[PDB]
Amino acid sequence: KCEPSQFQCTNGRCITLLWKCDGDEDCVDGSDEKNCVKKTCAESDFVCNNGQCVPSRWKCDGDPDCEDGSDESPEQCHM
Amino acid sequence: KCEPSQFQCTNGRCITLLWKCDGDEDCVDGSDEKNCVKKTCAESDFVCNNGQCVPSRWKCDGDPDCEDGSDESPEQCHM
Amino acid sequence: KCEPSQFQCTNGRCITLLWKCDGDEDCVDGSDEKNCVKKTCAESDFVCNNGQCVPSRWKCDGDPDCEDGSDESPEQCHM
Amino acid sequence: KAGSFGDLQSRTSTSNDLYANTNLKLQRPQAGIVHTPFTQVPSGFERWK
Amino acid sequence: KAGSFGDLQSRTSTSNDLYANTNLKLQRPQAGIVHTPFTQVPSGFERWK
Amino acid sequence: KYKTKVPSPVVKCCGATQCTSKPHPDYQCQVFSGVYPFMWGGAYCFCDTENTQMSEAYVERSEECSIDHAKAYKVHTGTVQAMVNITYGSVSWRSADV
Amino acid sequence: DLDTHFTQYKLARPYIADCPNCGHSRCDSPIAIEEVRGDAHAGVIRIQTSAMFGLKTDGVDLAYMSFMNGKTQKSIKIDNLHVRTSAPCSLVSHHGYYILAQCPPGDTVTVGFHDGPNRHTCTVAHKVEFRPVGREKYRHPPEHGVELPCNRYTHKRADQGHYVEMHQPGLVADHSLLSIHSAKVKITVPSGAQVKYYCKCPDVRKGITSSDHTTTCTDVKQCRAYLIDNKKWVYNSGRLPRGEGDTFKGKLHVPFVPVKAKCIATLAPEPLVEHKHRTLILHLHPDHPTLLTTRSLGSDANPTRQWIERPTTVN
Amino acid sequence: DLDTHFTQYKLARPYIADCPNCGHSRCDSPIAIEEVRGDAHAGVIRIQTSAMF
Amino acid sequence: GLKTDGVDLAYMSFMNGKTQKSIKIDNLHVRTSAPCSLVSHHGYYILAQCPPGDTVTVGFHDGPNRHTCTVAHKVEFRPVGREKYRHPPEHGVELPCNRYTHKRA
Ligand SMILES: [Ca+2]
Ligand SMILES: [Ca+2]
Ligand SMILES: [Ca+2]
Ligand SMILES: [Ca+2]
Ligand SMILES: [Ca+2]
Ligand SMILES: [Ca+2]
C-alpha cells in the first residue's frame, strides 16, 4: 500500500524501486532479490565457465582469478 | 550451632528450614536435597511412565507431553 | 647501527645487551634466542633425562617432579 | 501534586482502595506496531528520598 | 579567523573555488615509522553549533 | 566542516627532494631529513642517517556538507503581501492574496 | 546484483600500515584504522580500515573477508569481527574498506578479527559521542516519541556520487627473500615479482632483476630488497610510501554516504500549570535535561532560556 | 520440591513480541525486555522477558 | 607459566580442593570497564593495560567452570605533561614517565 514508484514484498512493507534485487534483502522475506533478469557482461572482460567476469589482463598470468580456474586451464591457454 | 528454626548442612553453614529439599543446592554438597520424601501427583493430573503429573486435558492430544511419550501411546489410548 | 653494548636483531631493531636470550623474543622474528650457549645445572639438584633439574629432596617421594617421569622410575628408584 | 509526596496514598498497607494521581497520559502508537505508549511524571517517593 | 565561523567558505555547494585557513602545520614523523602527522585548530562550524 | 586529506608521502632513500606550489586550499609541504623509516619486513633501505620524507597535506570540504551547512545571506527590504478573507451582503466568504 | 557494487573493488587489494596500540607496542597491523567518521545524529559511525570485507579471491561473498600477512593475500570467513568503543557495538554492514557500526559514546575505537589462534587488533584514539535530536538530551533512542528530521549514514552500498581514488603501490621491502646460497647472498623472486636490489658491500651495485641473480657479496645485512607488484592497486593512505613515476587516479565509491531521514526524539512529561494574577507557574518534572524557552508578544520579547535537569518551579 | 514451583509455568508458552533495537532496526524477537526492576540496594536487578528459562 | 613439571608460558596451575590442577591458558581475561589487553604473566603476577573504572576482575575458564573474582579498586588514567588527554596519541612530544617493566627479571 504505497506509491507505484515504490515496491512492496510479500510481508507488506513498502520499499523504493532502487532496492529491487540490488543484493541486499531489505524486507524480511527477501522476495525483492528473487525475480529479475541477469545483466550482460562487458566485451572487454574475459568470461569464465561459470560466468565470473575477470579482466583480460588477468588471463594467463600464473595465478587463479576464478572459482572454476578456467582462466588458467591448459585448454584456454596454450603451454 | 544455630537456632532450631535453622538447618545446618555437613560443612558447618546454617540455612533456614524453608530451604530443605526445595530444589536448589544451597551449600556446597547440597545435603538438604539428599534426604527428603517425594509427594504424590494431584487427582486431576495424569501420571506418565516416569511419574510426571500432566493434566487430563493434554491426554491423547496428538503431541508429546510426557517424558517417555506415554501420553500418546496406543496401549493407553484405545485406537 | 647502534652501540656494540646494544644487541641488533637481524630485522634492524637494536635492543640492550641485558636482554641477551633471556627467554622473551624481543625482536620480531626472534633471532635473539637462537644463538647462545646453554647454562650449567646446579650441583645440588638431580639432573633429569630431559635436562631439567629437580631438588634431590624431591627424589623418590612418590610424586612425579619430572616431565618424562625419570624421577619415579623403578630403574632409578630401588624399592 | 503527582510528583512530591502524595502521588500514591493507601489507607493501610493492604487496603483495596488507593488514591493515585500521576499525570498518566496515553500516546498514539507509531508506524503500525502493537504497543501501548504512555507518558507520566516520575514518582514523588523517589524525589522525596 | 580560522576558528569561529569563516574557516571554510565556498560560494556554492557544487562550486570549485574554496577559501580555507585552518592553521595547518605539518609535524616531523618520529621513531622511524611511515606516517604523516599534522596539527590544526578545530572547525569553527562545529564550534558555532 | 572541513576534511583534511593527506596523500602518500615520498621517501627518498639517500638524496634530496623538493616540492612545487600546487593550487590547493591550505596547501602545506615540508621536507624532513634523516628519518630512517622501519616498515614491515625490515628497514626500508640502506642509506643511513640522511633521507627525505615529504609528507604534504591539504584541506577540502567534507561529504556531509551536502546535507547540513550554514547559508550566508545579505538582506534588503522587499515586498509585503497578505491573504484576506472577505464577505459582504449576502455573498459568502471568498479569499485571495493581495 | 553484487557485481555492480563490487566492480572496482575487485581490482584493489588490502595492505599493511602502521597502527598505534595494535597490541601493546604499536606493531604493523593487517587492519589499520584510518579516518573514523562519527558526526551523525544516532551514534552510528563509519570506520575505514586497511583490510577488505565482503571479498574473496575466487569470488564476491558477504561472509568472507580478505587480508594480507607477509606478501600473500589470505581469505578467511568472518567469524568474530567486533567493534567496541566502551561496550561492544553492533555493526550494521561492511563493504570493501569500510565498516558501519552503532557505537555507545567513549574515547577509543577498536576493531579485531580472528582466523585461527591470532588476535589482530588495532586501537586508535578518537572521541565519539551520542548526538541527540531536538531539545532533550537523551542517551539512547527511545521506544516512542516524536519524529524529527535527522541525518544518518545509510546502510546501502550504492554509488551516490561520492568517490575516493586508488593508486599504484610503492616499493615494498621484504627481507625474507634474501638468503645465502653457499657463501654468497641469493635473491629469490616469486612468479615474476621483479625484485629490486641495492648492495654497498664494497660499492654500489643497484639494479633491477627478474630471475635468480645470485649477488656476489658476503653478508645479508649489507643489501636491501624491494618488490614491484602491479597486479592490484591500493588506496593512497598517509602510512604508505608513494610510487616513483606519475600515478593514475582510480575511482572507488564511498558506500555509506550520509543521507537525511527521520529520527525519534523523547517527549517531556506535561507540566502542571497554576494561574495567579498576571503570573504563570509551571511545575516541571523532567527525567532528561530539557530546554524551556519563553518570550513575550509585545514590543520587547525579553527572552529566557534555561536547561532544566532537576524538578524546579518557574514563575 | 522442584516440581512445586513449576506447577503453573508448565501450562504457559513463550511468545514473540516487538522490541526496539534488536540489531539496527527494531525487529520482532522471541526475547523482549519488559519491566526492568532496579529498586535494589546492591545494584542487583530483575528482568522479565518473553522467553522461558 | 608453571605446569607442575617444568616451564611453559602457555600453561597455568591452580588448586581445586587439595589437588594441584594444571591446564592450558585458553581465555584469561582482565576487565575494569572494558576488556583490557594483557601484556605478560609470571608466577603470581599479571600485567595488563586497563581503562579507568572502579573494579578489577579476572577469570579463567578451566572446563565448563567460570572461576571469576572481583575486587573494588579505583584505577585512574594518569596523563603526563600539561594536557589532560584520555588515551595516548599516535604522535606528539616524548616526555619522561614511569611505567612497569615489560620484561621479567
Ligand atoms: Ca533488494
Ligand atoms: Ca590468471
Ligand atoms: Ca535447597
Ligand atoms: Ca499429550
Ligand atoms: Ca630476549
Ligand atoms: Ca619425585
PDB file of C-alpha atoms in Angstrom, chain A residues 10-35:
ATOM      1  CA  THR A  10       5.137 -10.438   0.410  1.00  0.00           C
ATOM      2  CA  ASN A  11       5.382  -9.214   4.016  1.00  0.00           C
ATOM      3  CA  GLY A  12       3.652  -5.923   3.221  1.00  0.00           C
ATOM      4  CA  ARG A  13       6.415  -3.417   3.908  1.00  0.00           C
ATOM      5  CA  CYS A  14       6.965  -0.842   1.161  1.00  0.00           C
ATOM      6  CA  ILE A  15      10.450  -0.061  -0.168  1.00  0.00           C
ATOM      7  CA  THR A  16      11.753   2.021  -3.056  1.00  0.00           C
ATOM      8  CA  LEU A  17      12.307   0.771  -6.609  1.00  0.00           C
ATOM      9  CA  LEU A  18      16.077   1.350  -6.363  1.00  0.00           C
ATOM     10  CA  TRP A  19      16.298  -1.567  -3.893  1.00  0.00           C
ATOM     11  CA  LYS A  20      14.983  -4.066  -6.477  1.00  0.00           C
ATOM     12  CA  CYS A  21      17.424  -7.041  -6.347  1.00  0.00           C
ATOM     13  CA  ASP A  22      20.408  -4.801  -5.610  1.00  0.00           C
ATOM     14  CA  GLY A  23      21.948  -7.543  -3.443  1.00  0.00           C
ATOM     15  CA  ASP A  24      20.539  -6.591  -0.021  1.00  0.00           C
ATOM     16  CA  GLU A  25      17.342  -8.217   1.255  1.00  0.00           C
ATOM     17  CA  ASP A  26      15.684  -5.053   2.547  1.00  0.00           C
ATOM     18  CA  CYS A  27      12.464  -6.586   3.882  1.00  0.00           C
ATOM     19  CA  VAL A  28      12.015  -9.755   5.934  1.00  0.00           C
ATOM     20  CA  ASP A  29      11.113 -12.458   3.401  1.00  0.00           C
ATOM     21  CA  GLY A  30      13.638 -11.234   0.816  1.00  0.00           C
ATOM     22  CA  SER A  31      11.354 -11.642  -2.198  1.00  0.00           C
ATOM     23  CA  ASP A  32      12.848  -8.469  -3.709  1.00  0.00           C
ATOM     24  CA  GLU A  33      16.009 -10.465  -4.530  1.00  0.00           C
ATOM     25  CA  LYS A  34      14.108 -13.166  -6.436  1.00  0.00           C
ATOM     26  CA  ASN A  35      12.597 -12.120  -9.781  1.00  0.00           C
TER      27      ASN A  35
END
